[PDB]
């Protein structure tokens, strides 16, 4: 009488923001080892637990979709109990690590496990994206790609409207079989450097400011953005530190050109602190707040980036030896 335990990580974009909303575009997304956890087991009635928070309807919709998928697999959903917790859970959506996306993947991994199923990256991405698509969501779905793979990944988006229409016209089994047109592949840098996440403690851009920004998206942006991602990836696999630094800067500038709202006073500051250091920093996500990222290429630059961030009131959220 043992319950099953699963975990889901978070994610942060490295490049491709906004451009990724256009089908066929590319994005570089990093997985963060700050986990959301759940325990699951069959019981007398259906129950969702929290230690004596996440979107309740989101969890319910995921469970419903999973009941459909299990039905297709010749199995039936029965009363079970799900408990959700973990650092990601303790403090809602502060960080901007994709809480909402991590819950969907979490519930899906939980139910699949309870039913002795272990699907591949793409199917897990399809099941999770499906819930959001049925929900009307139109984001790129890059977060789920990164979270379903738990690797630094190169993501090529797909047309959501298309697949979303499929889900209201065809039966789940039919949609899951088709080709959505997305691509998820791991990226392995061949250099050793420090990756730092600086949290500005600021709320991210809202819906109005978001729409306004994408409305600024135009062909030069998409074309240059896609090229930059290709170069950053090459630079990472080829390991040219001076090359990674240039492209990240290019990417950062391509964003400032899209809208001055992405970069806020603290974010600029988070970025400026990279000056004259063998490192590079940049905004990550919808922008307007949340986190900023940095890659440092020597112990000295790293120590100085940290001290500068602390003095600026920027909280070191995470650190990893790429």
What are the residue boundaries of the structural domains of the chain, listed by start?
A: 4-188, 189-322
E-strand spans in the chain? 4-15, 26-42, 47-49, 80-85, 153-156, 183-186, 194-199, 279-283, 291-296, 315-321
* CA separation for the pair 108, 148 (Å, rounded): 10
Residue 230: is it exposed, middle or buried by C-beta count within 10 angstroms (0-12/13-18/19+)?
middle
Asked if 4-188 and 189-322 have one fold, the answer is: no
**β-bridge pairing 47-49 and 80-85:** parallel
* CA separation for the pair 172, 170 (Å, rounded): 7
* CA separation for the pair 11, 6 (Å, rounded): 17
Of the options 3.30.9.10, 3.30.230.10, 3.30.750.210, 3.40.190.170, the CATH number for the domain spanning 4-188? 3.30.230.10
Binding-site residues, in ranges, read 290
Q: State the CATH class of domain 189-322.
A: alpha beta
Three-state DSSP state, 28: strand
* CA separation for the pair 156, 183 (Å, rounded): 5
- The total of other beta-carbon atoms located within 10 Å of residue 88's CB is 27
Beta bridge partners of 155: 27, 184
Binding-site residues for Mg(2+), in ranges, read 290
Residue 141: is it exposed, middle or buried by C-beta count within 10 angstroms (0-12/13-18/19+)?
buried
- CB of 65 within 8 A of CB of 107? no
- CB of 266 within 8 A of CB of 313? yes
Residue with tokens 């789940």: 172
Q: In degrees rounded to 5, what are phi and psi of residue 277?
A: -115, 155
Three-state DSSP state, 5: strand
CA distances (Å), origin 111, targets 39, 83, 294, 315: 10, 12, 36, 36
DSSP 19: G
- Give, in degrees to the nearest 5, the angle at Cα 144 between 236 and 146: 20
- CB of 289 within 8 A of CB of 267? yes
Q: In degrees rounded to 5, what are phi and psi of residue 239?
A: 65, 35
Sequence-ordered list of residues with C-beta below 8 angstroms from that of 80, at least 6 positions apart, any chain: 40, 41, 42, 43, 46, 111, 114
Three-state DSSP state, 85: strand
- CB of 13 within 8 A of CB of 28? yes
Q: Which helix (H) or strand (E) holds 307?
A: helix 299-311
DSSP 202: -
Structure tokens at 145: 């790609």
* CA separation for the pair 15, 248 (Å, rounded): 7
Q: In degrees rounded to 5, what are phi and psi of residue 182?
A: -105, 170
If phi > 0 it is left, if psi is from -120 to 50 it is alpha, else beta; for residue 74 that is: left
- CB of 19 within 8 A of CB of 27? yes
179-183 contact pairs (CB < 8 A, 24+): 180/126, 181/23, 181/24, 182/125, 182/141, 182/145, 182/155, 182/156, 182/157, 182/158, 183/154, 183/155, 183/156
Output Rg (C-alpha) for the chain, integer angstroms. 20
């Amino acid at each position: 009488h043992m319950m099953i335990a699963v975990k889901t990580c978070g994610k942060l974009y490295w490049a491709g923001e906004y451009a990724i909303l256009e089908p066929g575009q590319l994005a570089l997304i990093k997985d963060i080892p700050i986990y959301m956890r759940a325990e699951i087991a069959f019981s007398d009635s259906y129950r969702i637990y929290s230690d004596m928070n996440p979107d309740y309807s989101l969890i319910q919709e995921t469970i419903a979709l999973m009941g459909d998928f299990l039905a297709v697999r010749g199995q039936n959903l029965r009363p079970f109990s799900l408990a959700i917790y973990g650092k990601m859970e303790r403090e809602g959506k502060k960080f901007g690590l994709g809480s909402s996306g991590s819950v969907v993947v979490l519930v899906v991994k939980a139910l699949l496990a309870l039913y002795n199923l272990s699907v591949d990256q793409n199917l897990l991405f399809k099941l999770t994206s499906a819930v959001l698509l049925k929900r009307g969501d139109n984001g790129s779905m890059g977060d789920l790609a990164c979270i379903a793979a738990e690797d630094l990944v190169l993501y090529q988006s797909f047309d959501r409207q298309k697949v979303a229409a499929w889900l209201e016209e065809e039966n789940l089994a039919t949609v899951l079989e088709r080709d959505w047109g997305f691509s998820i592949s791991q990226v392995k840098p061949t250099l050793e450097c420090d990756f730092l996440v600086g949290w500005t403690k600021e709320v991210a851009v809202s819906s109005h400011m978001v729409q306004q920004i994408k409305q600024n998206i135009n062909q030069n942006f998409l074309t240059s953005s896609k090229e930059t991602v290709v170069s950053l990836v090459e630079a990472l696999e080829q390991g040219k530190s001076e090359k990674i630094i240039e492209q990240v800067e290019v990417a950062s500038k391509l964003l400032e050109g899209l809208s001055t709202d992405i970069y806020t006073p603290l974010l600029r500051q988070l970025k400026e602190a990279s000056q004259d250091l063998q490192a590079v920093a940049k905004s990550s996500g919808a922008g307007g707040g949340d986190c900023g990222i940095a890659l440092s290429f020597d112990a000295q630059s790293t120590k100085t980036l940290k001290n500068r961030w602390a003095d600026l009131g920027i909280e070191l959220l995470y650190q990893e030896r790429i």
